[PDB]
Amino acid sequence: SPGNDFTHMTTTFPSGSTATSTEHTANNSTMMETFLTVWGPEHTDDPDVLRLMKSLTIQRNYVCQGDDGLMIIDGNTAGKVNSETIQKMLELISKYGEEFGWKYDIAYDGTAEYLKLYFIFGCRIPNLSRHPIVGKERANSSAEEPWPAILDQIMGIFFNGVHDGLQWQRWIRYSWALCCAFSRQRTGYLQYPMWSFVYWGLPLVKVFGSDPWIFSWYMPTGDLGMYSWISLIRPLMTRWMVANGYVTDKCSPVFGNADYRKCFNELKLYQGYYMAQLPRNPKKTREELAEMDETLMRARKHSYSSFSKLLEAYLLVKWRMCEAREPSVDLRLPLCAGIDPLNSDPFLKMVSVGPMLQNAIDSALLRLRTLGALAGKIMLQDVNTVQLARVVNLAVPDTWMSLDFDTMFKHHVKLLPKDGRHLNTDIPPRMGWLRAILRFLGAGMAMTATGVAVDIYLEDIHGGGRSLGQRFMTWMRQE
Amino acid sequence: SMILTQFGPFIESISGITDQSNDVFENAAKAFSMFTRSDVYKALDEIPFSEDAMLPIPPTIYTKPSHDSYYYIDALNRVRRKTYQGPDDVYVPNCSIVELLEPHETLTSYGRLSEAIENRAKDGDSQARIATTYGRIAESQARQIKAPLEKFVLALLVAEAGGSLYDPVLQKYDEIPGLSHNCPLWCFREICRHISGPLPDRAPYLYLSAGVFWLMSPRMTSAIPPLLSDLVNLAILQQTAGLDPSLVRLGVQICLHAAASSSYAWFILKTKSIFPQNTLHSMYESLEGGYCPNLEWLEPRSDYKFMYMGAMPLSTKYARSAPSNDKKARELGEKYGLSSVVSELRRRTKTYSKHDFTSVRYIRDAMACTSGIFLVRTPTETVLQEYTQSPEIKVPIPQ
């Protein structure tokens, strides 16, 4: 609205500052403690209410993070607490707020609401309408970013549909339709191949002559994602290559006698693999946009020889699916909403794994520590796998956050074959950091394969365990 | 069958029939760019819709009186609005829009905000500032989307054309009612046709980067671009979540009452607590069975160290002992004309009595039918609604 420009005097605070949260939380907890201590007993009859108030304190049951709080009233020996004295205490909370300005929004129904998460009998109910699909916030009237950054929001739609228990065959199938709709733009026009989206964490359906609906969307993104499905499908892929004239004379240690370079160049798998690593940010004009477009077209015109040094160093490791692990939680227990035996794959993964019920400095010091070279402490100690294996930029993905990756890394990924020691998988006593990366390379395929998460054992490293990590050290020298 | 003849080899690649390939992907993406906006509605015209998608769309959405009685000019010469229902009625109203338009070149049917009115508003006319205020806030309300809706609806039509799928785990097909039993798409077709009517090219607004364009007809109001983005979400989620259509029809019916209201966003602000209040806040009046987890948190209670120790079955004594809901949950529906929705929710909620996956997915599907839009209002009323309140100290501390 033009001609609308003024100033205004309030007593309120700014909306989203940082220090405006902490002191409000302190002020929440202090007034709740003096409620339960002093104002409580001094303003009520009905000694059931008095006995209820004198039994709880805010260290034992009160949790607050902002304006909102959650107070928990535990069960006694006789069962649950009488649900009428709780309401008589609720009226006293509402009366207590009026004496100094707070207008509480107390609620008592039998559920729990805290940080806008909805539970009933321990339920994990997702709010599907918390974020819409076709909805985006715009505060100003300015134009938006150019075209090749819309795919980040499309992947955001997909990863937000992951955490909510959608019908997974329908959800992946609709994600493909969006994924293929947002792929071409006028500038020869620009176009992403379909493998560039597989790099971004999007699972597939049926490729290379395989079974349909064969992988899961719990697969990671990046090189750890590209390792897993290839290492699961590889003896079928090397058959499908030879199935139409893609034979060379020498045998590769990975794909055998088939020219993976020509097959991947003609099918444009390499070009999607390297084209997905281009920056989608038009960093600091239409001519910079044209610079980014020419940089993006150059990756499509260039023909490629192999994958990155990290993925090629990964692909020498072979695992095995011997036997399924014992379950971690009851099948008939409703843990999480939406997922059920009708939603088959998360229902299998969440029972077999179990739900979670229990940076530049850290990078570069490990870069200089693993290569031959607090600062006096780091040299000999070790950290866990999820911290020690960040030296090759491996991270537990966004998808595995609502599961138990700790027990899976610690126990159910064995770095030793079932029939003893194959003499090929001999990690030296020196350079024992390799174990923390082999944990991730093991736990990739045990999560990408649909169905039950299976106990996985080490089988083979082709170049030897000593010569395996020299490739990682070459990547560390090359940065 | 037009989408079939257009996209034969792609739908079989993403339904598990044929192997995925790059050339079919790129030959599809060649065609995804080559769609007129009318082609999506031509593809919507051919699908036979069942009897359980048909419901009466009210006629009063299309005829709304204009915005002259809605805004005014305050002292200090800032624009405001006068509220008719409640002091929080500061959102965008719903009125006739077409009278403030001049057509674009290269196509006659679509117009934008006229330059003479913004010229006189920059000059300092009284009515022109109000008119450009309404025009810019209607553009900003219509803009709150990621991409044009016809692309999302076309992706729905592509993806859900492969029929039912097959499960490698359950070894059977799935049973999800198809496009004939999908009420938001029936309504999305009917509204976008009734706006155009005899006029062709049949897209009520197109979406660009800097601004929108409006279809020049008296049938066009400001409530429609949020309503269509509201319907597309339910049309997707009815497919890819397996929602019960008996809840989706209520979810569309509330949005039709929202478009028929005095204001759209204000009505949704006042009706955003119907689905959890009737369903989630009223579960298990009579509990008979089901399993529940057995947690405890460890004794230094500030650490928040938890522990899972099996799961026990429920007993009869753990019903809903909390107080009732009927006296205010029915009152909310009786105030706004949604008693046929509220009683419908309550009588269906009162039939679940065991705690398993069925009654839980009922709560999920009931919570899904709330409309997730982003409320749009000017900053000059955001401040003077939020920052003018004050605490009241009934017992101050003495001097």
């Binding site: 002559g209 349909p212 | 029939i17 044929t18």
Partner: peptide, 18 residues
Amino acid sequence: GYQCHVCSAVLFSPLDLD
């Protein structure tokens, strides 16, 4: 080998199809 008839899934090499 073309296609099984439980689910409409197309393959090659009927050593895979059986």
